[model samples]
Target: SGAIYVGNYRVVNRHLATHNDWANLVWEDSSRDLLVSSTTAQGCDTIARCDCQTGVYYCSSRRKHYPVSFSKPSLIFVEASEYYPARYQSHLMLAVGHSEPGDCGGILRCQHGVVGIVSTGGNGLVGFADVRDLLWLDE
Candidate 1:
């Protein structure tokens, strides 16, 4: 019974928004646990994973059922600037670390920068990238 056993754990979202769409980032823990979070729709913001040991995250879009995890920030704020309608662009970058209203700081593009600013008026969640080398939490 001293053999090392590996397992995978996941937090699945049965009901995800499409029109607005949402993205999530997942991380792995030392105990083979997982931490998941998503930024999409209007009210589908929450921490899907628990017991996060490190600052790692994996990004994924909720709009697609067979969504794949990405290595970027998911929180996006719409704003109108010189390029409006004709070229509507994001006014703010709501990613981990970068506290500024429209700045992703340097963490968003970091190797494991998965954390993102959910709301300027609210607390933000820590993020990280998924590591397969470590054991995976069971589903």
Candidate 2:
């Protein structure tokens, strides 16, 4: 199992190996598997999609296809920044590529473009103001 600590919440992955090269991004289990990495041979920023069952990965940016060798249910997390029209405040929204059953009780707050994650329970999770988003596995 793999767990990602973001702010006061701990994002855990019970399947597929969690890739940890990017910060402020969280991937979660979904029908579509998305991966964010800079290791593409093309030396370009790429987002790769992997078939959970086949372990086959395809990257459009690099125009390449390969097998990832991973066979676990997974999710993708993306860091997002948006402004609410009603609130008129810019918010750091943690965008999970897909939604699954899991604990997302942590509070997300931002001030001066700095976001903070606060845990509702004492889970020994630390918060970060610099992280924009992250991925997690479902329970």
Candidate 3:
């Protein structure tokens, strides 16, 4: 059986206690604080609010506060790492006086010992890389 994946324990239990049927998984945001979905059996929309520090949540339709835990699935870290290569490749390409296609026209530049990616169309910085102890890449 599918389990309630929200971060709060009380919220999940309340959902199970109040609703007799399965709750369809809906949309979750980056912070995992906002959750929106509908219950298949109850036909009611559920909105959950997460408190990251306390590890609890408040549900609107369920009308209760539940204790929950939050952890980032490994895939999020994997996906973030996937972009590092592209950033590196873009930096290398720009260094050679040629930029790869679909690169957002960004170039790597350094000022005051800080490296950053600047847009070709404007002076706005797209990203920054740190050079202190280790190289840092920005999103």
Candidate 4:
């Protein structure tokens, strides 16, 4: 689940997917890519599991904002979302992003845009499947 669920919101066209070491679950939520702390919160309950409570923390290695109303807040830094040489089985390509480790089976959201899923995570990074380029892999 994303952080919006911490309070109130609406949803549509929600989906879930997994690909070997990469995946993403996009929730059709949010209306824009509102940037705060200068970056977006890649929605995933994993951070919440990290105890990122309602306090202050690095929003994206630079900016600071109300670190999602999760459960535990800390000095953890929410980093940038990027594609780092990764895999998804069957000899295909995938993406590597950031998130709490236990966030498996959670949605990889870029604020409001549900573009990927937390297929697997380790070594401080996570592998996901970005539907932004997954036009052929339909559910």
Candidate 5:
């Protein structure tokens, strides 16, 4: 593994100059089993599958988790704007029903790509690390 298997990697605050919640956009390799600036060496990226029932109870930050249409970026940042959990500022959220504990990192997917990697959540929410901007790093 060339990168760290990060559950909560450090991130820079949106406005402050100081470094800090946890989002992993840019990705890199780690064939040497060393951490790529703690860039998460989880063997490979994760993905998910759903058999959501006929009644279909399940979840996003804006939508109510029944019907899924779409959004790419604005939905993410906007949700962040509506809510203020600075330490949890960048990792995108899902307005979920609930979770048990340590259901972390399910690798949220929709359409044919990732929504992000699912991590933490509670009574009314779940969160994921947003990496929709991987091209921001390179091709």
Candidate 6:
């Protein structure tokens, strides 16, 4: 049997959601609108739409920013306080933004209020498909 831990709904839900959770959890109630809405990221307007678990917009861009964070050293969304998890990790960065390290441990750096995953070890196991949007630590 799988072990279960008890805490708050938001914490457990946030961890389970991770990258996919961006669109699935954050905008679970209003994702559909975002999908169809004309939103842009990095000067590029949304084109192809991806559906998420919540049946909401889940635009490719938003999906990348899911699992938002709050705290120094982590990329904080424009609206940080709103998504603050129970732990109160300051200047949290989106968990999905940085690629998880494999063997040597990936390095994360935050500069100018932005966070980036500078270096990664192993076979690039931590490379995240959506690393483009969030700020990363440059080596």
Global Cα RMSD, each model:
15.9, 18.0, 21.1, 15.0, 10.9, 18.5
TM-score of 1: 0.18
Per-residue alpha-carbon lDDT of candidate 1 for residues 95-134, written as tens digits (9 for 90 to 100)? 2332222221112222332222222212443222222323
Note the Cα lDDT for every prediction shown.
0.25, 0.25, 0.22, 0.28, 0.33, 0.22
- lDDT tens readout by residue for model 3, 70-122: 22111221112321321221111111122221222121222222222211111
2 or 6, which is superior by lDDT? Answer: 2
Model 6, which residues run further than 4 Å from truth? 1-15, 18-24, 28-107, 116-125, 128-139
Tell me how candidate 3 scores on lDDT.
0.22
> What local lDDT does model 1 show for residue 42?
33
Q: Which ten contiguous residues of candidate 4 have the minimum total lDDT?
A: 30-39
Instruction: Count backbone clashes in candidate 4.
Output: 13
List the candidate 5 regions with Cα displacement exceeding 4 Å.
1-86, 136-138
Tell me, by lDDT, which candidate is best.
5
Q: lDDT (0-100) at residue 114 of candidate 3? A: 20
State model 4's lDDT. 0.28
Which lDDT tens digits does candidate 6 get at residues 53-82? 111111232223233232223322222223
Candidate with best TM-score: 5
Candidate 5 weakest ten by summed lDDT: 29-38
**Candidate 4 lDDT by residue in tens digits, 19-91:** 3112233332211111011112232221122111122222232222222233111123223334223322221
